[PDB]
Design a protein around this ligand. Sequence first.
Ligand SMILES: [Mg+2]
Ligand SMILES: [Mg+2]
Ligand SMILES: [Mg+2]
Ligand SMILES: [Mg+2]
Ligand SMILES: [Mg+2]
Ligand SMILES: [Mg+2]
Ligand SMILES: [Mg+2]
Ligand SMILES: [Mg+2]
Ligand SMILES: [Mg+2]
Ligand SMILES: [Mg+2]
Ligand SMILES: [Mg+2]
Ligand SMILES: [Mg+2]
Ligand SMILES: [Mg+2]
Ligand SMILES: [Mg+2]
Ligand SMILES: [Mg+2]
Ligand SMILES: [Mg+2]
Ligand SMILES: [Mg+2]
Ligand SMILES: [Mg+2]
Ligand SMILES: [Mg+2]
Ligand SMILES: [Mg+2]
Lengths: 41, 287, 146, 87, 95, 245, 97, 110, 89
Amino acid sequence: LRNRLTDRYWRVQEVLKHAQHFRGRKNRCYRLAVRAVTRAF
Amino acid sequence: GTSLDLLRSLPRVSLANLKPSPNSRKRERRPRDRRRGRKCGRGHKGERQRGTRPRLGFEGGQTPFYIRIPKYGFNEGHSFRHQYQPLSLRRLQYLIDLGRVDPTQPIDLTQLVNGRGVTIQPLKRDYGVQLVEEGADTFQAKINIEVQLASELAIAAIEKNGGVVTTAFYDPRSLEILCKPIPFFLRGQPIPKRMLPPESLVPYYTDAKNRGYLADPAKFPEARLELAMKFGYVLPDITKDELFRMLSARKDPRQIFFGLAPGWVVNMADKKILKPTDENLLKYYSS
Amino acid sequence: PLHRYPVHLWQKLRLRQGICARLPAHFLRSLEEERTPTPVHYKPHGTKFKINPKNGQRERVEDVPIPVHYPPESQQGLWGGEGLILGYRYANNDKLSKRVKKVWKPQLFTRELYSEILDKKFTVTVTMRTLDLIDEAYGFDFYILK
Amino acid sequence: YRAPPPPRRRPGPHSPDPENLLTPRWQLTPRYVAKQFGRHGAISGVPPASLWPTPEQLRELEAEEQEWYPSLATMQESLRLQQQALE
Amino acid sequence: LTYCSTRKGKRKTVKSVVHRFLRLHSGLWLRRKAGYKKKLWKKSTARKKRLREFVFCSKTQSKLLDKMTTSFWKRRNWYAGDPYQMYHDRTNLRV
Amino acid sequence: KCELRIPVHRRPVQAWVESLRGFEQERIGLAELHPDVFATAPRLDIVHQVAIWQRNFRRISYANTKTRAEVSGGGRKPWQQKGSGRARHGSIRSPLWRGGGVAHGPRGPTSYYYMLPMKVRALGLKVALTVKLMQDDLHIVDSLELPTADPQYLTELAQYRHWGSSVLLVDLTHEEMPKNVVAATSGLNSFNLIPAVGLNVYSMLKHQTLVLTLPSVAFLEDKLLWQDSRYTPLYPFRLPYSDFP
Amino acid sequence: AFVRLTLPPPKVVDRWNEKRALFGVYDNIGILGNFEKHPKELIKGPVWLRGWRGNELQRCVRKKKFVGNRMFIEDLHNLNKRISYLYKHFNRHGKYR
Amino acid sequence: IPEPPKHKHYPTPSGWQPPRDPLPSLPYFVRRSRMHNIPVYKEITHGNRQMTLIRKVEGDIWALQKDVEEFLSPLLGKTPITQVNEVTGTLRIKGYFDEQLKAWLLEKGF
Amino acid sequence: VKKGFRAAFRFQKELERWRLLRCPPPPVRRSEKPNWDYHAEVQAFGSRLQETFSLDLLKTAFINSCYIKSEEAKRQSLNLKDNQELFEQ
RNA sequence: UCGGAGAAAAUCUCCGAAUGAUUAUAACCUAGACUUACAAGUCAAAGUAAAAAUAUCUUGACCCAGAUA
RNA sequence: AACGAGCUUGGUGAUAGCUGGUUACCCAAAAAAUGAAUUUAAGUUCAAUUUUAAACUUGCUAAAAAAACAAAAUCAAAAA
RNA sequence: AAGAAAUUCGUAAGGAGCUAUAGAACUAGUACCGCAAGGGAAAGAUGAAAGACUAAUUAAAAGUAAGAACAAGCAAAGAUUAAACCUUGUACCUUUUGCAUAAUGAACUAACUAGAAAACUUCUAACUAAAAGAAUUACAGCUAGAAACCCCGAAACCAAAC
Ligand SMILES: [Mg+2]
Ligand SMILES: [Mg+2]
Ligand SMILES: [Mg+2]
Ligand SMILES: [Mg+2]
Ligand SMILES: [Mg+2]
Ligand SMILES: [Mg+2]
Ligand SMILES: [Mg+2]
Ligand SMILES: [Mg+2]
Ligand SMILES: [Mg+2]
Ligand SMILES: [Mg+2]
Ligand SMILES: [Mg+2]
Ligand SMILES: [Mg+2]
Ligand SMILES: [Mg+2]
Ligand SMILES: [Mg+2]
Ligand SMILES: [Mg+2]
Ligand SMILES: [Mg+2]
Ligand SMILES: [Mg+2]
Ligand SMILES: [Mg+2]
Ligand SMILES: [Mg+2]
Ligand SMILES: [Mg+2]
């Protein structure tokens, strides 16, 4: 593990903040939240 | 200059201020983003996509192009053919003009190579220099030169001015010593003898018209005269010339260097030349 | 890591330490020296140079001895340098035919030989080559000693 | 700080210890010893007479020379016969 | 093709090219015509003349042969009395 | 004065000769420096090239990883290909598995060695010397003799004369460097003393101000200028030559 | 993802230690020293790659040449297998022919 | 490289002639190579882009361009396309003009 | 433990943001904050409204009686003029 | 596999060739072209040489083995 | 406790023209599946297309009369 | 595809490595699995002091709780005074074909998990009829730098043990 990505937290937060007002696991789970956010956009 | 005045005003140069010349480096592209990711430039799935396309020259199962052409001996014996570096009278005149080849003393392959006038490569089958006629019309120098090959017109240019040209054969081992003599004296070995030409080359070097080093000296004056008449110049008697001794100087056919006999050892560190005394060793070298 | 010495030097270093060091100096020389046996199963090159026929140029030649297998039964007899040749052949003597395992074996005879120095007669497993060597040496005792 | 002394190469004839088994073989040939004389001349300690072939070595050179390098007279004679056959 | 050799780490020449084609220093390649020694009795006189000639190679064929041979086969060779001495350079070529 | 002949069209460059014997002995002489050494064109790309080479040809990286072949175990097939509902696998040590080999990792010790042309590296010493002079960071001195060996003196002298925080000092040869200079500089992190054969572009960019003794100036001018009117090497320059030391 | 809840200890780099201060000295030992020594003689590293560079296949073969006969049994087995892996990739597999 | 020997009569039979003295008084100076020749080089890129390059130019490199443009314009009939590399100190011209530009410099005394 | 110092520093900012939301700070007088010069602020106040004031009077207007009591209390442990008279007018 | 005829150039409808006999014996060299993925396949002025212009009619690479000079 | 031929380790990262997968942004251009050979038709090589850079000069559409078979594909001066 | 030799040259403690899914399989060849050869793990975290009572730090993952739901629909978007009603809108990746309402794969979270080389071309410099720190190339070339070509998966085959 010479180089490991250290910003993954903020990458996840970017997509999540656009999904917090959905209902279901779409609002908290990145894999499902990401697809729902794009459809909104 | 005005550029240096700009440095005076500008801040200090330091490791934190470095920059390469613009466009000096291209940027390498990793297969990460959508543009260069995904199939990654390889195309849709297939042999060429997995990396297993056939070898270069394969044409999908028909007899390749480089196999259906008849085999022919264009390059037979290429490694055994002799190669002679070409020297033109333009290059020879140019070297003399700038002082890079001194005409006062005799010119031999050592001096030519020593002046960066020619580049000799014995490993690539160089066996000497061939004189090239180009530049003869403008050649106006009187010089004594030894070259492994020479042409009829090239000889005429040298002799018309009153110089001397002779053709001498150096064997593959002798040439390497001749080209780089000092990287040899440092070894610590005695100077080897110079071997005679192979049977094929014997006629060329025993013929006066070619100025062979093994040719009959009595036959030269006839050859010199005929060449002079053919090219419409008057043969100059070089015996009267003040520097006749230098012009006529010629090393022994078993000698590599002018003043060094075969069998001697050159102690460069002590500025000495050890010479043998044994009889069998002296008979070996003097043969 | 790495060993300090190449593995091929290990046997020499072993002879040079311990009780092996205390062994007689002359005996170690026999152990140390390696000499090729006189050719038996191959024809050596007479010269060190030959003229290549295809390109008509002189090229160096060297002698590469065949690998010969010496069964332990041979150490109880007097084979004149002969052994087993474990190799392959080409069926029908064309390299486009199959490659077949082949073993060439010496013809062994039982013979009784007399030693003058020992004044005893031994019964030995022997090859016709060994008998020829003794004849060339002008005696069984001369053969062993020479 | 002060920098250490500049790197320098060994300044004189080098004869390796033969007993050591880690000494490379090339450094122990009769050709590496000559190299010491040519570079450093007399101070090497090579006995000058050892720079020339030894009696047995000389015989090898002459025998090899006769086999592979003919004399000038023989070459011309061989050339003449070929021309006569060609004519 | 061998791109990196086990012993020397270099590319290797394909000795089938070296035995069939001649490369001029300018970049051209010469070859023979396939079949020029075959069944000459049933070939027309004009056909045989075409077969005997030394012929050039196309741009893509030359590009392939350059890939299959190493640099040593692309150097300038100074042979005395060479019969291809004049064909190693191009003259009056604007293109 | 420059020993070698300056080009006719270029006038020489000059600097103040200095002495370290006292604080106030700033101007004791006037010196002439070959314009082609200390007044070459300002080329900072070449300075970047040389500075990179000095930092990259020495680099040997000792990073390594095991590939799937070098990881302990792994020979057997975990389960049968079919009739399991599982993903197909052939080893427990593939890159996908935890504890498996690295697919594309550092492989063994690697070297970054390369050599720049000798003329290019010589130029970078000429360009660097111009930069220090034209930017008023080069101080030519007659000798490095110092009145005292206390390190306090050398640092105070640097402050009085408006030198930088770091000073690079050059002397002609290591063997003859004065004892007073050795003692003081030995204990100083920022003031480094090197022999004239150790001068390089990287150390002239790390140290703010350069101090050259007059003999070193002649030493440097000879070596760098020799590069401009020389042939290509017939054989390495340590072998005997007609005119080369 | 999860992140550190406290700042890691401050990292201090002393830029004027002897190694950093005197870095790069004697790199012109050749041009400024009459060419008695090449700078590549000043490199410290593995025996098989001082003053030399190559791709992984080239590096594997060269290590074998220099120290192959002093290597351990397990290492020589792995080194030999790496050569054959790299030989088959560089000479049979890839986009470009 | 030896300094060229003095010759009684110039130009030398090869054609070489040393830089004239006293020096030219132009704003720019063009230096000779180590082999004592005028540093004008024919160059080609892509196999069809022909160029001529003047190296070792000191002083106002821009002044040298103006002179070259005037010098070469009558032959071409249009202003020549050039690139001035001020960092390297070289002037690059499209097309082969080495012969005319070497004789030109010789007269100026460079 | 992943390398690096920067990711930890970024998350420290997030921890600060969360703490303020959960435990909002008590509002503080702008004077106690940095970047404050009373004399300059008073002049800007007048110039903001495009009006000319006598700075001495404006300063008195801001002063309150309660402020004086607090200062005297701290002093116990220049009487000045209150805004009263200006307030009435 | 190639050639000939129709559909009329995509698949369909039909015949033939793996030569044959005749012979004036039909040379060498060299512009420009046709055809063509490559490979193979076509036509040919001028010059020279033989003779006293002419070949008429209707097809398998490389390697490797041979034969004579 | 999976025998048309046991199991284990090594050869071995076996090979797979087959299935799956192949990780940030932005700007731009962009085909095909026509032809040819191939134990070749689930592949590959060449042509053809596309593309990037460079050199310098005509290109696209349209194109009369007149021609090659004929009441629009070739060819195709001047023009625009 | 393989590949020499003659011959020449040669005197020398560190890390732009890993930091608990990484680095050795390793806290251990142990536990455990296998009749046997053999295969083969997982994990720990106070402080100066525990003769200070073994600490703290964190809206922070999925999952839950606090707090079940309220006509109507890829679950959102436009909005709105208003959470929902009204309006618009045939999940995603691969794949078919450039289409699917086909069809493959995905319960979710965290971590890990796949393009690598310099023959030719291009770009940036050094010197230039020569370039290169010996061996090489050269009818403007030569030297140096920069720029490139994946991961996982069989049935099999062979050697030696069991
Ligand atoms: Mg050459
Ligand atoms: Mg394994
Ligand atoms: Mg197995
Ligand atoms: Mg497998
Ligand atoms: Mg691991
Ligand atoms: Mg064709
Ligand atoms: Mg005719
Ligand atoms: Mg595979
Ligand atoms: Mg297939
Ligand atoms: Mg079509
Ligand atoms: Mg066909
Ligand atoms: Mg077939
Ligand atoms: Mg028109
Ligand atoms: Mg572990
Ligand atoms: Mg583990
Ligand atoms: Mg939660
Ligand atoms: Mg609704
Ligand atoms: Mg289906
Ligand atoms: Mg890459
Ligand atoms: Mg098989």
